Amino acid sequence: QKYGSRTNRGEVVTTYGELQGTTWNGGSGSNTNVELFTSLDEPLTKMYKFMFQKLMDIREVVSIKIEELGASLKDHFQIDEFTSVSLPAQETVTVLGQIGCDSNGKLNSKSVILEGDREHSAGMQVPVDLSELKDYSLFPGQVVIMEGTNSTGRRFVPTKLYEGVPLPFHQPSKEFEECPQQMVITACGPFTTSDTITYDALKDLIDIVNRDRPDICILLGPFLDAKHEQIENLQLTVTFEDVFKRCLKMIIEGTRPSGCHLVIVPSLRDVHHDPVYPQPPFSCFEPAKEDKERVHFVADPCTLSVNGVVIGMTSTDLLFHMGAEEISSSDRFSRILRHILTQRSYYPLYPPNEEINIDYEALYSYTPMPVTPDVFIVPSELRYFIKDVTGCICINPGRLTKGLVGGTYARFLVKSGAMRSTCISAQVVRV
């Protein structure tokens, strides 16, 4: 009722980049090449056996994460030697470690501990005293290098916190120099109103897709939300798989006129899918022979290459997860986004939030960020935004539905080699 009678349909709630006309048109995915970013590491494309984590394996994965990031930072900063975190230090020493909270609550400036890696510290921890640090921004699981002293052997006092070093951007090949600008419409779940299971917002978005004919449509989960009031109280008369199959059929068949490449990203809130992160791609739907080349069932997180433009995307609410734990000396979202980019992982928070199941071997293998993406799609319960963080266009299109009321989606234009202005324009628009 409330959604159907909305009056702000099509309103542009946020804008960035070159001004464009009131109407956006795309190439219908004609001269479009969508693939997974070809990096050294193989992508997650199939289910991996889970529910069996050895504490030793978790220890090894965390330790190697710290060690690898510290090695890269040491080469970049020309640091001579790292020192064990636990040992006393009367003079200033450089220490590599990861941040954490001394208790189970939320991190605060008086509850910070630094845990070293196995190579340099035997995994030992030390309390941290942030009284002598003038500026800082710390979240649990953050790999840091600090110059400080430990006079009592019991409390590390940092004096310098080395800044993060983001990965270099992608240097596109000339193969896509002559390709036109590409239009991407991105939306995130939930796709149905809190009190309905009819997917009205999804129908409106599909109508928008057919109207504007974008080159890529990135749909992020959930598609059958686990927190939907109907799902939790067991009022559904059909199986979860059937509802999800109906939703996917609606999406794929309804986009036939647009000829738009669909990129489907699962969510941890998908009640019908495996609850593990990194999430494998959906595998319960077989597109018809006429839609096989258009539909891309990708994994969470995903690094996509679109005519040379690298788009990073994750369904996980990274900003909400890290905002609850980040502590700063004095834009918060920009700080968190820079933290994500500099840590070079799509989920650097450790321990994770209570709402995400992390398989740490798969996390090690499939969460490293190959490069710094040209566009980074990070849907969040927080407010929509389009930010420029260290040259990367971070887009939060919100969620298509916000409770009983309609939500928002985003549309942006990407061209490889433009001007670094790989993102010509971007807009958060209302549904």
The answer to whether 45 and 314 have CB atoms below 8 angstroms apart is no
Helix (H, G, I), strand (E, B) or coil at 351: coil
CA-to-CA distance for 411 and 179, rounded, in angstroms?
Answer: 19
What would the DSSP string read from start to end of 141-195? T-EEEEEEEESSSS-BEEEEEPPP-PPPPP---GGGTTPPPEEEEEEES--S-TT
Least distance to another protein from the beta carbon of 230, Å?
Answer: 10
CA-to-CA distance for 189 and 202, rounded, in angstroms?
Answer: 9
Least distance to another protein from the beta carbon of 38, Å?
Answer: 28
Least distance to another protein from the beta carbon of 55, Å?
Answer: 6
The answer to whether 60 and 53 have CB atoms below 8 angstroms apart is no
The answer to whether 223 and 244 have CB atoms below 8 angstroms apart is yes
Of residues 368-407, those binding another protein (CB under 8 A) = none
Least distance to another protein from the beta carbon of 136, Å?
Answer: 17
Least distance to another protein from the beta carbon of 400, Å?
Answer: 23
Site string for another protein, 136-155 (x = CB under 8 A): -------------x-xxx--
Nearest to 154 by CA among 187, 181, 124, 198: 124
**Piece of 191-199, 267-275, 371-379, 422-430 that binds another protein (CB under 8 A):** 267-275
List 34, 69, 107, 413, residue binding another protein (CB under 8 A) = 107
328 sits near another protein (criterion: CB under 8 A): no
Of residues 275-314, those binding another protein (CB under 8 A) = 275-276
Least distance to another protein from the beta carbon of 112, Å?
Answer: 11
Least distance to another protein from the beta carbon of 304, Å?
Answer: 26
**Piece of 245-253, 259-267, 313-321, 349-357 that binds another protein (CB under 8 A):** 349-357
324 sits near another protein (criterion: CB under 8 A): no
Contacts of 253 (CB under 8 A, 6+ apart): 291
CA-to-CA distance for 61 and 80, rounded, in angstroms?
Answer: 25
105 sits near another protein (criterion: CB under 8 A): yes
CA-to-CA distance for 34 and 304, rounded, in angstroms?
Answer: 7
Nearer to another protein, 238 or 404 (CB): 238
CA-to-CA distance for 301 and 367, rounded, in angstroms?
Answer: 7
The two structure tokens encoding residue 37: 């970013």
274 sits near another protein (criterion: CB under 8 A): yes
Q: What are phi and psi of 424, to 5 degrees?
A: -65, -50
Helix pair angle (240-254, 200-212), 10° resolution: 20
Nearer to another protein, 62 or 73 (CB): 62
Query: Which positions lie near another protein, rule CB under 8 A?
Result: 47, 49-56, 58-59, 62-63, 81, 83, 87-91, 93, 100-108, 110-111, 115-118, 120, 122-125, 129, 132, 149, 151-153, 157, 226, 231-232, 234, 236-240, 271-272, 274-276, 350-351, 354, 357-359
